[PDB]
Paper text:
The Prx subfamily enzyme Prx1, also typically called 2-Cys Prx, is among the most highly expressed, soluble proteins in the cell, and is characterized by two conserved cysteine residues. We used the mechanistically well understood [name] as a prototype to construct a chimeric Prx, EcAhpC1-186-[name], composed of EcAhpC (residues 1–186) and the C-terminal [name]-segment of human Prx 2, to be compared with wild-type (WT) EcAhpC. The chimeric EcAhpC1-186-[name] described here demonstrates, that transformation of the human C-terminal [name]-helix into the related bacterial [name] confers sensitivity to over-oxidation on the chimeric enzyme. Structural details of the oxidized and reduced chimeric EcAhpC1-186-[name] provide novel insights into sub-steps during the catalysis of peroxide reduction, enabling the transition from a fully folded to a locally unfolded conformation. Together with mutational and enzymatic studies these data unravel the fundamental role of the C-terminal tail as a molecular switch that mediates the structural transition between the FF and LU state during the catalytic cycle.
Residue numbers in the entry:
A (entry chain E), C (entry chain C), G (entry chain J): 1 to 166
B (entry chain D): 1 to 164
D (entry chain F), J (entry chain H): 1 to 167
E (entry chain B), H (entry chain I): 1 to 163
F (entry chain A): 1 to 165
I (entry chain G): 1 to 162
Write the structure that this text describes.
């Protein structure tokens, strides 16, 4: 099952966003660009650098009409604690979805079954819910947030201008 | 169906114990009394009072030759953070087993499937690996550690002295 | 795969309660707190002490609006004889449910398959039929009735006060 | 579920490389870094700019010790023609693997079933055959060759330095 | 699928006999005539008359080399209590097998599924383990122990005397 | 999975009764006490002492309102010949049901599959069609018809006196 | 399946032959011509005329080296009794095989399922066990024994003279 | 099991009858006595003597009210050629059915599977479609047409006159 | 089982015809004679001589009322490129259907599974959709277009003269 | 799935050939070129013209080392009679296979199931048993023997000359 050019499945998760807890579903992603940013676990060494880089470009992403959704198999309670504890996480103004069931992770075909943790994968989704770009990496290899912007800018261009001349 | 009077299944989990990570297996529970103390999640309101009450009786439990294994579906990385953050958790000198896969939790038939978290349950296991007592409770209801000691002492008595 | 926070399954068993035989069903437990007190068999040494300790606290339980149901694989005819012969059993004013088919014992996942007897297990059930507390013990270990009252009084407090804890 | 951190499956495909036809298998990728670069079809509009960008960095990729394998459902005969006709494809000095059966494309879960063409997907494979980085995009969106070099250089660093990890 | 002229299946039940508990299996019945006397439950009104009638003829059955096995879905603990309380049960010197699992009863296809009790059934078994006679009745109809002796004596005659 | 206290299955068999052939079905048994007296074969040497003993008590059985049905895998044509030949069969006034198909026999779970003959079994059936007593025996062992009357008289009592014995 | 030119199946049946019981099997037919004369039941009106014909021609059949086996679903005990009573049956010196199981009748594909009786069929079998001729008729219609001999003599001719035909 | 006293199955085959081709089905056999005379193949040595015999008695068969159907696995085109060439076949007035699919042959359980031909079988069928007589023989043994008449006359007698 | 005297299955394939791309379906073949001319691949040595031979007789075919459909596992884009580069392919005025999914090829039981290419096979179809003639050959063996016309003229005769 | 470039299945049929009956099996076709010329039935109108046209070129086919096998669902007995009756069939010297079971016909996927006859199909088979050319036609349409020779001469060339290919 290649997920590229396919509609995202429904979900119902608890999240953390700017101090308060909130519920986030597939209804909230409708009519807007979305970025489902998966990562293995909280209180790890590589994850804060990736999430912190997306936080630096979040003003730029919000201007383009793009929501971000940080996802992992930890609870929404853990994300609140990690936000206070870590400095690079504290600057995150976007939602941090908790996925203890692994349902949201299994919808995007991104769980490490033997570990019970989500792989390092980023999914760019359009207003209609269709997955326009995927980027999966190994445990050590980091994801650049400047390339993610280039992909969203490119995805937005082709949506607005289908079948461009060359 | 019932897990009472059955042998515990094999497992392999990472855990946090006294400022250091370790791997814990069924081999580490052999030949000793064990307590698998399940709970839903870290950074919650009810768990610290339960885990803290067992931490206060850990001096007494170690004297009786009893190991304690706190278990939940959070990672072993999360248990290190919660130990540093919370004060009632900081006094826990026993192992805190991380179970992201939920394998250990599903071995003890103690998983909330729709929540992805372990239920509040305590399992007393003897040196041979046989489950001698099970306690399970709802979200609001707390578990008393003095009642756990009463059952472990009763379980130890009948093991050494059958038929009275 | 846990019976905690799940609705009890329907049943139809014959029982003994204060010198007469009666039929008890899941309909009888509706709209009331219930305690299903399983034990292996009649005419044993450890069971009278457990059942006698609950019999001492039955005035307090009936005060709190709680019905007690002693269950074993033995017949309702046997419960009438054990009530007459034994002195610690004679003080039981609550129902002794017979379960020769093992249907009630299997509904609560509490049957010793190779022995054909119920395990020592107590189930606290609320007015809606949801199991709020379980307590299973080995053959040698005894169950404390004072601890049972704490869990019922705890369970009643959380139901009456939603969004609170103990 | 997820092809990340899994071994590549065996294959046998014909390919065009520097004016001659050759057979390529999984044995050829053993003990080496390999990039499997999937794309829809030859004689299309967006595909040559993507492939041409990787051709500009092939001097750098060869220096790191990295094979490049361009893959599509077209035949290896078609790749030779597209090499001659198009200017952007002429500069390519890596293998253009034909996959008319779609076996290589299906091994990486990268087929458009109703269309019969491969999706725009890049896979970075290490010496042991393990997929260390995946990159898929929709029909309109183009892949960046400099970003691929970052991920390969990262992957090479993690392999050579156990314990250490790139942010 | 009739059980007449078929070998009995293996079992492993606990039983009460003469003020002590014992394990009984299929190996004990081998090389001897056996009587598997099923009945519904202990502390009932009509079961003591059936069992007590067999207890009167047990002297004659022991001379003929026949073991009696009273079986029900009650526990072997219950059989001890019913022995002390009732006068008609107190004279039983044969084994009272408890079958709480219902395995022994289900081997002889004699279980009431909806009721969880055994039917009133008598099975005569020869030294080889083959069932030579079956007698099953409803829950108001007794079983004559004199008729059971006649069948055992007939079974012993034809077993020894070929054709 | 026994057949005590279960309703009998339907059937259609030819029978012999007092110098004439007749067809007997489950409808004929409705509302009355019936005895299905199975036996292996005709012209055998386990003398019809079983069938003859029931024939001696048939006058008492007809008083109580009990229809006797002697069933076997042999044909109804055979039963007529065995009735004329044998002295002990000649006194049988009750029906002798033939069952060459073995349908009636397989309904009562009484067929010897390797032999193709019925086992020595006696089923007591009540007015509702419910089996109230079973008595199966081995080849050599006979069946006592005075004992059979005790079971029917006991069965009739518990039917007419509910909630007691 | 067409049974003509196919080997007969194995069997084990009891039979009556000249005032004594015997066991007939497929071994006994080997190296000899055999006739399986099926009929519905004993003590009926049509069959004694059929079996009486074959009894008259048995002198000629034994000269040709042909065994006869009169088969039916009635027992071997009945065939004894029918031999004593009826005059036309009393002159049968060949074997009368009983088949209460129906196994022999079902091997020759000759059972009335709803009646539980064999159909009026005659099978001619050669020394190797191969069926050389089949003759089946309805309840009312009779079989001619003079025609059966003409089929046997034709079958014996083609066996001893391969190539030539009748 | 046996086809005696069973209704014939449906069919739809082409046949040769007196120069011209025709189609024959169940509806043609309805309300009339019928004889399905099977045989292996055309242009063989034994077959024309068997088919020549029934051709001689066809005058008597049509008088009684009987239809003959000669059946084989050869085509209806082949039966026309064999009728012209052979003298013994040329006198056949009855319908020669071709059955290349083997559907009619398999309906009467008369196919030798390894050879793909029909066995030498004769099926007498009454007006209702019920098979009243069967007569099968091996390759060498020839069938007698005078016997067939005796069976038909016997079948017509018992049908018209019971008791 | 044989495909002779059976109805063609539904399809939906893109094609190249006289500069512009088009979609062709089973609806387009209805009420007219049709020729499905399969071959292994584009930019090969033997295929231009076969397709060029049919291109020479397309004047005569269009008179008889037959639509030629050249099918292969290559894309409709590839057919346009091959049409521009080669001279023998440039004279083809009939449709060049692309079948990358292999559905049209697998409908006609004409797929080399291990190679992923169509076998050299020609199918003559009538207005009702029924296959009246089949010609399949090996990799080396070429097909003669003069024979194909004889089959079509024979098929058209027996349809009109039953 | 296609039968082109596939090995023929085993068989055992009786055949008529020059006034005598002979058994023919897959063993007889080994190491030689074989033509399985299927047709529906004997004593038909359009079939003699096809079989007679092959009979004319049979001298040339035997020269090239090619055996012809005329197959149909009629018996080998029927073929003898048709060989004597018809003059166009009398000149056939090749084997006329009788297939009343329909085993040989089903091996080549050539049976009309509802009719119980073979379709008009010619199968050219090489010395190794591999089918090199197929030619199926409808009931009305005839098969040219001159085309069949062209396919056999082309098939013989490519077998003996690796590398080269026919136009």
């Amino acid at each position: 099952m290649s997920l590229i050019n396919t509609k995202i499945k429904p979900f119902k998760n608890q999240a953390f966003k700017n101090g308060e807890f909130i519920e986030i579903t597939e209804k909230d992603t409708e009519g807007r660009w979305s970025v489902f940013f998966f990562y293995p676990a909280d209180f790890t060494f590589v994850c804060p650098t990736e999430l912190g880089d997306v936080a630096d470009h979040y003003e730029e992403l919000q201007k383009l009409g793009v929501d971000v959704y940080a996802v992992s198999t930890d609870t929404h309670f853990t994300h609140k604690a990690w936000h206070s504890s870590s400095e690079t996480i504290a600057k995150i103004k976007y939602a941090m979805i908790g996925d203890p069931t692994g349902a949201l992770t299994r919808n995007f075909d991104n769980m490490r079954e033997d570990e019970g943790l989500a792989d390092r994968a980023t999914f760019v989704v359009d207003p209609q819910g269709i997955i326009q770009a995927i980027e999966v990496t190994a445990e050590g290899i980091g994801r650049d947030a400047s390339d993610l912007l280039r992909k969203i800018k490119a995805a937005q261009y082709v949506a607005s201008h289908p079948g461009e001349v060359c």
